[PDB]
């Protein structure tokens, strides 16, 4: 009656049956579209304009009020309207092919209203509005187009079966979770931020004048979701002042207000009240002693009105009357102070209570009673997914659209023109803004590009199925990528189960870019009202009636960072809340953290909290199953039975949700993990349980197995248990076999290199015209596989091959991380691949005249024709599929008319009227035209895409890698006869050097080879899942059972001499990957060619025939060598040699005519004394740039002593 690992994997299988790997993106977007858009519309629902009566002296002057109310929003399915005006439903593949944004139009119900003031003599603002005119029904008005995330509930592919996906040219394996903007796929990278409504106390480092700072980043639940931030700074002890003063930094205040003054502005004038707010214990004298100096500092202000005046004088406005200053101070104190607590009248008591709480926390850290906060604790951070981000963007864009509508109202009213609702809205605002933000990633308005966030949207990575899965689950921390702050980059303890420990890029973004674990769930947010209602009805004492003195031992209750009140029995409250969540009466995303030392009960329901699921251990006092998992074997058998059953209703099967709603699985975030005790496996629970039942928990232990620490006797109750430790890994770390037998940076290196492995990325790559694609001819699934691969679908779309690898020193061509590849194996298709590239062109147009034509250009009329071949183009200016092209051969023929007024030296004969703008093939590439797609673009102009294919056979210089960070290039290829063989005639496909193994300590590579050999011999698949009881001893026994040396060695013979090698070789199958780094993609040589126009130096880039940079370090190396002429050649004769004539009198470049051999300096009237200077063109450019700043850099060739 103990849970097994097979049962754990059945539970995980159910999880992934009901959960997609793109679930976070999809659910966030669904939340944004279904709910957040309506809330954003409502928050700015009404627009009102009051036309007062100007005193023009004409009888008939009456004030008017015009009102526009924005109603419900309607989102249709994505559609396209053509040039001819026909409107059709649009499908993702057509959008990808024709470069169309896959967006759905949005309509909003607007209603208009006009009212007349009852009397015009009333003071402004007191006019009574009588209903004059009103729209009987609303007008459904198109306001914009929202890009639709693929596979979301509003996509055309939602609820669509596999067969219909094929009919649409869609891969059933594709998970969606992205957008199509102008044909390109864009994924929104989750953005990490610090949580709002949390008080964080930070110790400022010396010699900063501030000792400690308590900061809260207050955000309204839905009212723009984050505006105000406050600080409470304690100032450092000074030799002049015997005490430290507490000053509150508030929005829109130029100075730090002493805390007592802001308390008085809140009505807590008496000192006793203030120190009861701050120091809840009268008997504690250190707190009051530290508060005394600020009371001393703030005695000059003893009343609320004087405190408000003090605040107002320090507002951003100077030279204002006292009444306005007091009004402004009260307005700031009400609205811009702690808006998450409240923003409405009569709530100064709660804000004062929370301010006292913040001061108490900061002084607890200043007394060194509690440690400061950890800025990097994962439970204090939130992930903004597509939902929240698109919500902020749409709020901004809808505000801009409403401003436009209001300006339209004002302009129409001024001119007495009739107001039309349809003409009022500039629908281009929302459409263009969303399109621009999703396309460029620059997050915000086009006009605030520098201040906007960047890189929020990235082109989806279609190199391998696993790389795409990884890209859909990527988080970015917007820390400075140049500043060297190792702490944010480090792997925190709280990352356990939330972020992948291994998968993180190497380089500047190491540790900042993170990847969600397999079972990590990111909350989308839920209402806090039901939870507050349950708290109120269960005995929550409101904060208005709370008196700390009466109940100092009672526990503060927070919800979303709002101190709602105080409870007297927080244990029972917490058990009741947890029970409710365990029935889903409360949302499963709700964090219920009881902090016993701090006497707090924090509830969280907001979005962005990363959670992970865990088993629940039965802890009920009267239960007969103390210390045993709630989930029985019966529940597992139910999962197996309902997995296959399809006759059952799809929504009424027993699966993952049935476990959560039944109280057998619980989602915990990092905040709640701090209050739980988690067993690492059911066997650990059991061992602890016998240890606690008096049994010795002792037995004969397989010496080959991992050694675990003995069960801790100090642990008597476990609250949870992990479903499987292997779930702490990401997409790519879950493809590594035996990752727990490797040195961790090798796991990171494999996680990075698995993205670049060649395979089949989508099944529909044939019908997709991608810019770049690399496809493996004969992909094979690994012989050694992890159980997590079933959910990553690596067996379905693998990205490598099982090569027979021998670890041997054979001819010395595999040294320094090179490999030797069998040439016969290459000839038979090993690691062969296809490279597809796509060239896009289209017809342009300006005004009413088309200035481009897809045609076969003719030498006799087209000016400036390229040097490539125009003979492979067909009559329609294009190139047919199946033809062979190379280098600069033209694949698309396009011409542009020239203005009739242009006269280019007569080179443009009377026949020459056009100019060639054709598209040549890349100079460094050649192949066969695979495909030529022809269509029309959004503007009804012709639009062509030419896909070329080119087979790449492995050769010397091509990167290959194992799944263990073992990367190399091919150094040499030997044929079948020349390679070492076994007594069966097995010849390895690859030979790798032994020296790669010891230093790197990639023992997982050797264990993989042995296990793959066993599985190839026996046919059973090899389980390489981490943290299993699969030992090398068991694999050795299995291998010996097949008549092989147990450790994987084989007697091999020399191919050259047939002699039996003195050493026995480690030979067996290992999964290798062809990497996107091919030598021919990189080989580059330049003799001469293009130069930059400005500097006249070799251009940059292999693709554009550019030179290589001779940098500062190379110059230093040649200096230390002493090779003066080498430097002169590299930096002058080979880059930008140039000649000028300087005047020997003034030292400035002269006017030189070499044709006439006449030189002149008008300034000096010099025509005889000149010098010839050889210098870099960049030097002459620098000198001219200086002369443009009135600096005269003068070159004198003779010592002017």
């Amino acid at each position: 009656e103990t849970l097994t690992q097979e049962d754990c994997w059945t539970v995980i299988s159910s999880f992934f049956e009901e959960t997609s790997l793109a679930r976070q993106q999809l659910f966030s977007f669904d939340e944004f579209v279904q709910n957040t858009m309506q809330e954003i519309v409502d928050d700015d629902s009404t627009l009102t304009l009051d036309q007062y009566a100007q005193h023009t002296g004409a009888q008939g002057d009456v004030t008017r009020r015009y009102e526009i109310n924005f109603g419900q929003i309607y989102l249709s399915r994505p559609t396209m309207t053509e040039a001819d005006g026909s409107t059709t439903t649009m499908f993702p593949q057509e959008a990808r092919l024709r470069n169309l944004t896959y967006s759905s139009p949005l309509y909003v119900d607007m209603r208009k209203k006009v009212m007349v003031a009852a009397d015009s003599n009333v003071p402004i603002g007191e006019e009574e509005w009588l209903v004059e005119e009103e729209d009987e029904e609303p007008s459904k008005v198109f306001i914009g187009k929202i890009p639709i995330m693929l596979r979301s509930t509003f996509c055309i592919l939602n609820g669509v079966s596999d067969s219909e996906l094929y009919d649409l040219n869609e891969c059933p394996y594709d998970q969606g979770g992205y957008f199509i903007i102008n044909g390109s796929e864009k994924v929104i990278i989750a953005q990490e931020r610090s949580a709002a409504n949390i008080v964080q106390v930070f110790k400022k480092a010396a010699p900063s004048p501030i000792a400690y700072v308590a900061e809260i980043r207050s955000a309204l639940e839905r009212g723009s979701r984050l505006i105000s931030s406050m600080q409470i700074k304690l100032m450092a002890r000074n030799t002049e002042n015997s005490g430290q003063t507490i000053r509150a930094t508030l929005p829109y205040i130029r100075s730090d207000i002493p805390i007592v003054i802001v308390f008085r502005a809140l009505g807590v004038v008496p000192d006793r009240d203030i120190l009861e707010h701050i120091c809840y214990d009268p008997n504690d004298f250190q707190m009051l002693e530290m508060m005394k100096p600020c009371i001393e500092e703030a005695f000059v202000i003893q009343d609320k009105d004087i405190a408000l005046d003090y605040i107002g004088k320090r507002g951003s406005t100077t030279g204002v009357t006292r009444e306005k200053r007091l009004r402004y101070a009260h307005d700031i104190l009400q609205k811009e102070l702690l808006p998450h607590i409240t923003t409405m009248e009569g709530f100064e008591t709660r804000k004062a209570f929370f301010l006292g709480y913040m001061i108490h926390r900061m002084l607890l850290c200043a007394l060194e009673r509690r440690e400061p906060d950890d800025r990097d604790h994962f439970g204090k951070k939130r992930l903004d997914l597509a939902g929240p981000l698109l919500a902020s963007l749409f709020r901004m864009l809808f505000r801009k659209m409403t401003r436009d509508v209001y300006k339209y109202m004002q302009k129409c009213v001024e001119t007495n023109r009739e107001f039309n609702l349809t003409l009022a809205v500039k629908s281009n605002i929302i459409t263009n803004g969303l399109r621009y933000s999703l396309a460029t990633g620059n997050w915000g308005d086009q006009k605030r590009s520098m201040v906007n966030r960047v890189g929020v949207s990235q082109v989806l990575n279609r190199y391998t199925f696993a790389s795409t899965l990884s890209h859909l689950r990527r988080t970015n921390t917007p820390i400075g990528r140049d500043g060297k702050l190792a702490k944010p980059r480090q792997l925190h303890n709280t990352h356990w189960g939330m972020v992948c420990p291994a998968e993180t890029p190497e380089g500047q973004a190491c540790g900042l870019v993170k990847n969600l674990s397999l079972m990590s769930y990111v909350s989308v947010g839920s209402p806090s009202a039901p939870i507050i209602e349950f708290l109120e009805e269960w005995g929550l004492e409101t904060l208005e009636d709370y008196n700390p003195s009466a109940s100092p031992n009672a526990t503060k209750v927070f919800v979303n960072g709002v101190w709602l009140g105080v409870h007297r029995d927080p244990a029972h409250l917490t058990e009741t809340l947890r029970s409710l969540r365990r029935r889903l009466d409360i949302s499963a995303e709700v964090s219920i953290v009881r902090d016993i030392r701090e006497k707090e009960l924090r509830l969280f329901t907001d979005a962005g909290r990363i959670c992970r699921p865990l088993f629940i251990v039965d802890n009920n006092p009267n239960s007969e199953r103390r210390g045993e998992l709630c989930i029985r074997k019966e529940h597992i058998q139910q999962l197996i039975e309902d997995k296959d059953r399809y006759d059952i209703d799809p929504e009424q099967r027993f699966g993952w949700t049935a476990l959560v709603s039944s109280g057998l699985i619980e989602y915990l975030d990092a905040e709640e993990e701090e209050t739980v005790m988690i067993a690492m496996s059911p066997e650990d629970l059991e061992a602890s349980r016998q240890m606690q039942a008096g049994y010795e928990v002792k037995e004969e232990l397989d010496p080959a197995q991992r050694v675990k620490p003995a069960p801790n006797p100090h642990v008597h109750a476990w609250t949870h248990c992990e479903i499987h430790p292997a779930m702490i890994l990401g997409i790519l770390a879950s493809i590594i076999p035996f990752p727990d037998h490797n040195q961790s940076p090798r796991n990171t290196y494999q996680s990075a290199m698995g993205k670049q492995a060649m395979g089949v990325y989508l099944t529909n790559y044939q019908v997709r015209m991608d810019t770049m694609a690399n496809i493996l001819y004969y992909p094979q699934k690994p012989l050694a596989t992890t159980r997590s691969m079933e959910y990553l679908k690596f067996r379905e779309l693998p990205a490598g091959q099982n090569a027979i690898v021998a670890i041997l020193c054979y001819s010395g061509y595999n040294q320094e991380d090179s490999i030797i590849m069998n040439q016969a194996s290459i000839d038979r298709g090993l690691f062969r691949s296809i490279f597809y590239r796509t060239y896009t062109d289209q017809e342009k147009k300006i005004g009413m005249t088309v200035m481009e034509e897809f045609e076969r250009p003719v030498r006799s009329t087209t000016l400036r024709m390229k040097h490539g071949t125009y003979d492979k183009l067909e009559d329609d200016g294009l190139i047919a599929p199946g033809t062979r092209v190379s280098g600069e051969d033209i694949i698309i023929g396009k011409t542009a008319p020239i203005p009739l007024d242009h006269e280019e030296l007569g080179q443009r004969t009377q026949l020459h009227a056009k100019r060639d703008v054709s598209t040549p093939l890349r100079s460094t590439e050649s192949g066969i035209v695979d495909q030529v797609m022809v269509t029309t673009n959004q503007e009804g102009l012709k639009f062509v895409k030419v896909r070329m294919r080119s087979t790449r056979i492995p050769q010397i210089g091509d990167k290959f890698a194992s799944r263990h960070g073992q990367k190399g290039t091919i150094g040499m290829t030997y044929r079948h006869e020349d390679m070492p063989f076994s007594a069966q005639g097995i010849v390895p496909d690859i030979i790798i050097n032994p020296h790669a193994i010891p230093s790197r300590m990639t023992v997982a590579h050797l264990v993989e080879c042995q296990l793959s050999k066993v599985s190839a011999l026996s046919g059973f698949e090899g389980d390489a899942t981490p943290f299993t009881d699969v030992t090398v001893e068991a694999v050795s026994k299995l291998l010996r059972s097949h008549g092989f040396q147990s450790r994987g060695f084989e007697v091999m013979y020399h191919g050259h001499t047939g002699r039996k090698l003195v050493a026995q070789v480690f030979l067996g199958p290992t999964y290798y990957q062809r990497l996107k780094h091919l030598v021919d993609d990189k080989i580059h040589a330049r003799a001469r060619g293009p130069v930059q126009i400005l500097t006249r130096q070799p251009v940059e880039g292999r693709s554009r025939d550019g030179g290589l940079r001779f940098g500062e370090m190379e110059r230093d190396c040649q200096i230390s060598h002493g090779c003066s002429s080498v430097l002169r050649e590299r930096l002058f004769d080979c880059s930008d040699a140039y000649r000028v004539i300087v005047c020997d009198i003034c030292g400035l470049i002269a006017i030189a005519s070499y044709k006439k051999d006449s030189y002149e300096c008008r300034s000096c009237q010099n025509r005889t004394r000149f010098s010839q200077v050889y210098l870099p063109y960049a030097a002459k450019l620098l000198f001219q740039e200086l002369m443009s700043m009135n600096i005269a850099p003068r070159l004198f060739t003779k010592n002017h002593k």
């Binding site: 303890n493 356990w496 005790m677 690492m680 037998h741 300590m1001 943290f1027």
Partner: protein
């Protein structure tokens, strides 16, 4: 396993992972891997080695 010159830090409150109790200074809790690469790391050891 050593992070910033010291044993694995208490990133939770007085524990390194939610699998140990508070104030556990024992070798296993703070990042001592008694296993070899051949034998395999336990999940806690795997995480600590990843941190290093």
């Amino acid at each position: 396993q050593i992070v910033e010159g010291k044993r694995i830090p208490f990133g939770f409150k007085y524990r390194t992972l939610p699998h140990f109790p508070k104030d556990d200074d024992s070798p296993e809790s703070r990042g001592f891997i008694e296993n070899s690469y051949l034998r395999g790391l336990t999940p806690q050891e795997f995480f600590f080695h990843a941190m290093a």
